[PDB]
């Protein structure tokens, strides 16, 4: 579901709600068209009508994602949904909660105001009010006249509202939808949604009935105001105290009242402004340029750039886009973030393999630099590694790049908290024909295990540079039979995670024995394979 992830968006939303409430209050309180109506109804008319105006906008804001899904189904296509990082996910729920609570507050105000209004309306019908109210209410009993008091039946003040709320539309639906709202809010409480889902998701589907009842709810135009045509003829400010001679004199013809227009839509302004503000926020956040901070060299062609950009969330295991207008004005190249979160730079490792990369050497001399533009951090996250106890890392060929992101990030969390780091040891196993042009990673391995030795610890270590074919080098295939057993016997109930990165030729060779090794019960030895998924 959509969200804004911005304090500016929240502020503009609150401002829009306040503005809508004030504007509709003034619109229904000031004009002389709603003179007799508000005279009979006190101040409850505006206090009851403005919250409905705000509630329509808030309810549409709630419902919008379902309309988006329906439109996507109609088109026959569907835009690729964004990934989850547990931060872009657990901030939309906050917005959902705030919108739901504001809907509840406005519904409470509207219900209280109309509950107050109905009492006066049914009290004025009977001979139990001031003379002006009872004189006004006794309209429409004859022909060629339209009523103003909707309680067109004299029973009593108590039990009169009970009959009114049942025999009259928009009163039964009001009760039905307020019960639905109460049930929806109560069902989604904590200790009911977290612990259970058969009673949260199933009951939360009362929103269809709630929305149907709301759509039916506004109809029959029960609240009536003086018609524009008859307003000029009536000349209200003169024929106001002559309540007892209406119709029987020429200057004061009997006024006629009609309901509100049945299709006006002035509240869309809200959803429209919120959308435009979100889009402008996205524009600002993406216009800022990127400034190169540190550029370094490496053996052969492994030039690495470190740049700082405002308002960037590196995350982990993602990929960004790089574009140099000097080399070409219409090309975006993808690269993998070889860095860690809570840092400042990017550290994207590029190696000359073609011509555009060489465009950063001849055009951008190394012995006053091109303006690099970075698009954003797309791609699915990789956080299951940080949520495990023991890990089984196995790289391969050119594809060890993303592992450098994890290693530079696991140690940082240790120096900060040293309690949430549930990792035990990185069983890193690097397989390659040669390390000819990957010296930037082998350097990192000795700069991590040795560096972290200062705090009197050698828990992970396990640098295992291995040679497949033609510095503990196996000089051959690292056979996996009995390899995992020796380390799986240390901790019962093994949750070892293996993250392969290589061709499918050796991929299925790892899961063939994993199922065989497993046995029933929450005690046996088993390592889970994620296959092509990381």
């Amino acid at each position, epitope marked *: 579901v959509n969200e804004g992830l911005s304090i500016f968006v929240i502020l503009v939303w609150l401002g829009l709600n306040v503005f809508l409430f004030v504007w509709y209050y003034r619109v229904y309180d000031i004009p002389p068209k709603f003179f007799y109506t508000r005279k009979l109804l006190g101040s409850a008319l505006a206090l009851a009508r403005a919250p409905a105006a705000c509630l329509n906008f808030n309810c549409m804001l709630i419902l919008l994602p379902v309309c988006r899904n329906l439109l996507s189904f109609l088109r026959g296509s569907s835009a690729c949904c964004s990934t989850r990082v547990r931060r872009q996910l657990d901030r939309n729920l906050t917005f959902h909660k705030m919108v739901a609570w504001m809907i509840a507050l406005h519904s409470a105000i509207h219900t209280i105001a109309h509950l107050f209004n109905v009492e006066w309306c049914v009290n004025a019908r009977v001979n139990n009010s001031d003379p002006y109210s009872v004189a006004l209410s006794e309209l429409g009993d004859r022909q060629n006249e339209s009523y103003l008091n909707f309680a067109r039946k004299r029973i009593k003040n108590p039990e009169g509202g009970l009959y009114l709320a049942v025999t009259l539309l928009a009163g039964i639906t009001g009760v039905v939808i307020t019960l639905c709202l109460i049930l929806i809010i109560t069902s989604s409480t904590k200790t009911i949604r977290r612990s259970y889902f058969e009673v949260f998701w199933y009951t939360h589907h009362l929103f269809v009935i709630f929305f149907i009842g709301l759509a039916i709810h506004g109809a029959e135009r029960i609240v009536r105001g003086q018609t524009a045509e008859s307003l000029a003829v009536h000349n209200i400010t*003169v024929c106001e105290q*002559k309540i*007892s*001679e209406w*119709g*029987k*004199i*020429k*200057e004061c013809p009997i006024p006629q009242f009609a309901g509100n227009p049945p299709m006006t839509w002035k509240w869309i302004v809200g959803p429209m402004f919120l959308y435009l503000c979100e889009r402008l926020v996205r524009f600002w956040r993406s216009q800022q340029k990127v400034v190169i901070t540190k550029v370094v060299t490496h053996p052969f062609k492994t030039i690495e750039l470190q740049m700082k950009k405002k308002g960037f969330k590196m995350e982990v295991g993602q990929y960004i886009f790089v574009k140099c207008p000097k080399v070409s004005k219409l090309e975006w190249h993808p690269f993998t973030l070889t860095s860690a979160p809570e840092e400042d730079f990017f550290s994207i490792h590029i190696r000359i393999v073609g011509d555009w990369t060489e465009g950063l050497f001849n055009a951008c001399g190394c012995d006053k630099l091109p303006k690099i533009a970075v698009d954003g951090p797309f791609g699915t996250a990789s956080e299951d590694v940080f949520s495990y106890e023991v890990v089984m890392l196995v790289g391969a060929g050119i594809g060890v790049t993303p592992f450098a992101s994890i290693l530079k990030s696991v140690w940082y969390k240790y120096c900060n908290n040293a309690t949430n780091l549930k990792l035990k040891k990185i069983y890193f196993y690097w397989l390659c024909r040669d390390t000819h042009a990957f010296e930037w990673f082998a350097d990192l391995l000795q700069l991590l295990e040795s560096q972290m030795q200062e705090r009197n610890n050698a828990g992970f270590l396990s640098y295992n540079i291995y040679l497949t074919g033609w510095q503990k080098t196996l000089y051959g295939r690292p056979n996996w039979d009995n390899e995992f057993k020796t380390i799986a016997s240390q901790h019962p109930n093994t949750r070892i995670g293996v993250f392969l990165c290589g061709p499918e030729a050796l991929a299925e060779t790892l899961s063939k024995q994993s199922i065989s090794n497993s046995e029933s019960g929450p005690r046996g030895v088993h390592f889970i394979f994620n296959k092509e998924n990381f």
Partner: antibody
């Protein structure tokens, strides 16, 4: 429940006069009109101007527009002011209350006696 | 703008007879009439209002009926001390009018 007015006598042509109508037992309040009429000596009754106790709405006959002014003072006195008197206005003047009966229909009850306004040189 | 006239100017009826007076307007006034009786002395006294109802203390002999633009008053049981002048007034239009009080009738006792 009884009205009474006075303040008219022989005046020279072209002058101005004011007649005041007072009542005992009646409070000039509510929504009952106050309605001034006059009658020529031995002729039919004529309608001059006839105001409203509530608010300040006033109405006048076509022949007596602007020349006559009606005001309500102290909630118990009503004054009619006439300007540029001629020889035609030498008639008796009545002060009457336009009671608005239940339902809407109205009548002219609780009249007051006359006041022989005469204009001559 | 609005003209209201009485059809008979002076009717004559013997004691124990009948009297009929017709007041007709120039527009459809929604039965907002009122009939007054004026003796040679005293101010005129109201008889009926609304063209059909009765005042307080008036004998039920006086009768009025009509609709639209034509209205009528019928006198039952004419007797002594009933020779006076009768007027019809319209409480409908009071912003463009000249008299709004009818013309009057001069019923007198015949003996």
């Amino acid at each position: 429940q009884s009205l009474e007015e006075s303040g008219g006598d022989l005046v020279k042509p072209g002058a101005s006069l004011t007649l005041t109508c007072t009542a005992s037992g009646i409070d000039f309040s509510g929504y009952h009109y106050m309605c001034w009429v006059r009658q020529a000596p031995g002729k039919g009754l004529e309608w001059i101007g006839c105001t409203h106790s509530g608010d300040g709405t006033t109405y006048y006959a076509r022949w007596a527009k602007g020349r006559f002014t009606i005001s309500k003072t102290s909630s118990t006195t009503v004054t009619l002011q006439m300007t540029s008197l001629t020889a035609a206005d030498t008639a008796t003047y009545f002060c009457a209350r336009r009671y608005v009966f239940s339902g809407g229909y109205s009548g002219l009850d609780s009249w007051g006696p006359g006041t022989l306004v005469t204009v001559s040189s | 703008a609005l003209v209201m006239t009485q059809t008979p100017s002076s009717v004559s009826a013997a004691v124990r007879g009948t009297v009929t007076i017709k007041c007709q307007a120039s527009e459809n006034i929604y039965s907002n009439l009122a009939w007054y009786q004026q003796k040679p002395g005293q101010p005129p006294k109201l008889l009926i209002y609304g063209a059909s109802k009765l005042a307080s203390g008036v004998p039920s002999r006086f009768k009025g009926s009509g609709s639209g633009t034509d209205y009528t008053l019928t006198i039952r049981d004419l007797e002594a001390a009933d020779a006076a002048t009768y007027y019809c007034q319209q409480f409908y239009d009071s912003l463009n009018t000249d008299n709004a009080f009818g013309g009057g009738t001069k019923v007198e006792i015949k003996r």
